[PDB]
Amino acid sequence: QKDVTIKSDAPDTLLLEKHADYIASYGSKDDYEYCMSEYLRMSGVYWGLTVMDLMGQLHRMNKEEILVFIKSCQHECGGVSASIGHDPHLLYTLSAVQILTLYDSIHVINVDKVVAYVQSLQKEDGSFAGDIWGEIDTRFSFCAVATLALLGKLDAINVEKAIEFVLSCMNFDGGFGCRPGSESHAGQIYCCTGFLAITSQLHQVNSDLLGWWLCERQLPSGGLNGRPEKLPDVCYSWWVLASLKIIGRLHWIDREKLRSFILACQDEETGGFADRPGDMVDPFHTLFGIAGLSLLGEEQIKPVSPVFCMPEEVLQRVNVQPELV
Amino acid sequence: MHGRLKRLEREQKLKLYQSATQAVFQKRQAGELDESVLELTSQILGANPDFATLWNCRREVLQHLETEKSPEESAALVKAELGFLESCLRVNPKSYGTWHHRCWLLSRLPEPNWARELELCARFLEADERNFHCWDYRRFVAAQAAVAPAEELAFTDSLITRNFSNYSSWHYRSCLLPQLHPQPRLPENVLLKELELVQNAFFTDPNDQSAWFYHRWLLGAGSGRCELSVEKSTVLQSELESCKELQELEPENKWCLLTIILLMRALDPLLYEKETLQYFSTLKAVDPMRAAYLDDLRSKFLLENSVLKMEYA
Ligand SMILES: [Ca+2]
Ligand SMILES: [Zn+2]
C-alpha cells in the first residue's frame, strides 16, 4: 500500500555516460554532504570505484592516490579505518580489501595483520564484533568472511561456530536479522545469504520460503522495499535481488517493472541515482541502481557478483566464486 | 542518504563541525582524555550520530575518568551520559552508534535501573512500532533483567490489538512462544490459541500483511496432516470458509486467496486438487507480479500430489 507512483516523464533509458561523469567528478566540487560523510569515506571510495568498473570507466579514477590513502588507513592492529585519523572497523577493512582486489594491489597493505585483526573480532558464540567496542551484527559476520575469502584466508576463523551463529539468526519467515531474535530485513538477509554462499551452507536456507518473502518486497510501482510496509528504495534493488540470485529465485521478481523503477530513479540532469524518483542523487544509490540493473541482465554493464558486489571478471581473476543455489 | 527531496547557514554549520572535529582529534593525539572532549563531541554527535570514532572517544574519556574520579563524580557522569543519549535518540532514533553506546554504558553500571530502560522502550515503540533498533534494545534489556517470556508475550498482545504496523510484534511473538513452550514446533493448544488471535487480526484488517505472514508460519508449525485432530480439522475448515467469505468482500485481496490454497494443502491435497488449481488462476490474475512464484509453487504442489498418488496401495 505504501508506494511511490512514478511520473510519466520519469527517465526510461539508461544514462550511462552521465553516471560515469557524476561519479568521476564526485568529491571534487568543501561540499557539505562530502564533508559530513568522512566517517564512511573508504566505503564511499569502494562504491565509486566499483560502479565505475561495472561501467568500464575505472581508469578515470585515481589509482595511485587511492592506494596511498588505503595504506595510510591501516592501523597497527591490522584493521582499516574509513579515513585517516578515524578508528579501524571491519566495515572499512572489507571496503579496502575490495578496492585493492579491484586494483590487483593487495600487498599495498599488510595482509597477515588484516587476517589477525578479523580473527581477533570473533566471539565465543561464533559472531563477529565490528571493532574493539563489541557491537555484534550479522553484517560483521559477512564482512569477516568476505574479507577473508578475497584474501584466501577463510581458514583463519572458526567457520563452524560462525555458521552456527548466523543460522541462530534465521526467523519464522525464512529471513535473517542482525542478532538472534532480530526481525528480518533485506539488508541482513543479503549479509547472511552472502555469508552462507561463501561458507558453502546455502542448503540450510529455506529458499522457497525466503524467496517468497523477498519477492513480496516488490510494490505495484515495481520498486522493492526492505521489509513489509515500507517505501521502495532503489538500493533494495541490490539487497533483495542479490539475495534472490544467491538462493536461485531471481525470476520471482517482475523484472521489467523493477527495471522501469530503477531507471526512474536516475537524475537526467546531473546523473546519479536517488533512493526514489525525484529525491537527491548519491554515489551509494548509483552503485546499487547500476548493480541491480546488471543483475537483471543489462548489456551495457559488466556482470556483477551477487555475493561480493564487484565485477565477476575480478573474482574470476582471484578464483573466488562461491556456488549459488 | 535517504529521503532527501529535490546554503549560507550550511557553510557556517560546516566550519563549526570541522573546527570541533579538528579539535577533538588533536586533543586525542595529545592524550587529553577529559570533559572537554565530551563537550566537543556532544556538539557533533547530535546532528551526526553515525560518526563512530567520536562515540569511541566518549568511551575512552569515560573509561579514563572512572579511574581518576570519585564514585559520586563517576555516577554523575554516567547520569549526564544517559540524558545525552536520550536527547540524541529523540532527534535520530535509528542510529546504530547511539543505541550501541547506550548498551555499552548500561552493561558496565552496577546497578542499572532496567525497569526504566524497559519503559524507555515502550515510549519509543509508541512513536514507531517498527523501529528494530528499539526492539533489539528491548530484548537486550529483558535478558539483562531476566524478564520472563510470558511478560513479553503480554506486552506483544497490547501492541497488536491497540493498532496495526504489527510485523515486529508478530515477529517477537514467533520467538517468545517457542520459549515458554519450550522444546529441545508448537503444542496444539498453543497453536489453536494463536490461530484464533491471528485470524481476528486479518478479518479486522485484511490489508494487514503481517498477520498473513505469521499465519502461514502457524500452518506449518503443527504436528501436521494427517495427524489432524478433529478440533484442528474443524478450525482449519472454518478458516477456509471465512477466507472464502472475505474473498467476496475483498475480491482484489491476494493474501486471502493464497491462504485458501495453503489451507487446502493443510487439509487434503488430493481431495482439493481441482479447487487448488482454480485458485491459482484467480490468484495469478489478481497478483500478476508474483506469477513466476505462483507457477513454481503450483509445480511443487503438483509434484507432491503425484508422489501422494504413487503411494497408493
Ligand atoms: Ca586514472
Ligand atoms: Zn537506499
Curated annotation (Swiss-Prot), chain A:
Tissues/organs with expression: Most abundant in the heart, brain, spleen and liver. Less in the lung, muscle, kidney and testis; in these tissues, more abundant than the subunit alpha.
Intervals holding PFTB repeats: 16-56, 63-104, 111-152, 159-200, 207-248, 255-297
Residue numbers binding Zn(2+): D233, C235, H285
Membrane-crossing residue ranges in chain numbering: none
Function recorded in the entry: Catalyzes the transfer of a geranylgeranyl moiety from geranylgeranyl diphosphate to both cysteines of Rab proteins with the C-terminal sequence -XXCC, -XCXC and -CCXX, such as RAB1A, RAB3A, RAB5A and RAB7A.
PANTHER family attached to this UniProt entry: GERANYLGERANYL TRANSFERASE TYPE BETA SUBUNIT (PTHR11774), GERANYLGERANYL TRANSFERASE TYPE-2 SUBUNIT BETA (PTHR11774:SF11)
Gene3D superfamilies: 1.50.10.20
Assembly: Heterotrimer composed of RABGGTA, RABGGTB and CHM; within this trimer, RABGGTA and RABGGTB form the catalytic component B, while CHM (component A) mediates peptide substrate binding. The Rab GGTase dimer (RGGT) interacts with CHM (component A) prior to Rab protein binding; the association is stabilized by geranylgeranyl pyrophosphate (GGpp). The CHM:RGGT:Rab complex is destabilized by GGpp. Interaction of RABGGTB with prenylated PTP4A2 precludes its association with RABGGTA and inhibits enzyme activity. Interacts with CHODL.
Pfam families, sorted: Prenyltrans
Protein name: Geranylgeranyl transferase type-2 subunit beta
EC number of this enzyme: 2.5.1.60
Keyword Transferase set for record: yes
Catalysis performed (reactions): geranylgeranyl diphosphate + L-cysteinyl-[protein] = S-geranylgeranyl-L-cysteinyl-[protein] + diphosphate
Curated annotation (Swiss-Prot), chain B:
Catalysed reactions, semicolon-separated: geranylgeranyl diphosphate + L-cysteinyl-[protein] = S-geranylgeranyl-L-cysteinyl-[protein] + diphosphate
UniProt keyword annotation of Iron present: no
PTM annotation (Phosphoserine): residues: S87
Expression by tissue: Most abundant in the heart, brain, spleen and liver. Less in the lung, muscle, kidney and testis; in these tissues less abundant than the beta subunit.
Gene Ontology molecular function: Rab geranylgeranyltransferase activity; small GTPase binding; zinc ion binding
This protein's GO CC annotations: cytoplasm; Rab-protein geranylgeranyltransferase complex
Enzyme kind, highest EC tier: transferase
PFTA repeat start and end residues: 33-67, 77-111, 113-147, 148-182, 190-220, 235-269
Record-listed E.C. numbers: 2.5.1.60
A GO biological process held by the record: protein geranylgeranylation
Regulation: The enzymatic reaction requires the aid of a Rab escort protein (also called component A), such as CHM.
Keyword tRNA processing (UniProt): no
Keywords assigned by UniProt, alphabetized: Leucine-rich repeat, Phosphoprotein, Prenyltransferase, Repeat, Transferase
Role noted for this protein: Catalyzes the transfer of a geranylgeranyl moiety from geranylgeranyl diphosphate to both cysteines of Rab proteins with the C-terminal sequence -XXCC, -XCXC and -CCXX, such as RAB1A, RAB3A, RAB5A and RAB7A.
Family: Belongs to the protein prenyltransferase subunit alpha family.
Subunit architecture: Heterotrimer composed of RABGGTA, RABGGTB and CHM; within this trimer, RABGGTA and RABGGTB form the catalytic component B, while CHM (component A) mediates peptide substrate binding. The Rab GGTase dimer (RGGT) interacts with CHM (component A) prior to Rab protein binding; the association is stabilized by geranylgeranyl pyrophosphate (GGpp). The CHM:RGGT:Rab complex is destabilized by GGpp. Interacts with non-phosphorylated form of RAB8A; phosphorylation of RAB8A at 'Thr-72' disrupts this interaction.
Protein name: Geranylgeranyl transferase type-2 subunit alpha
Source species of the chain: Rattus norvegicus
Gene that encodes the chain: Rabggta
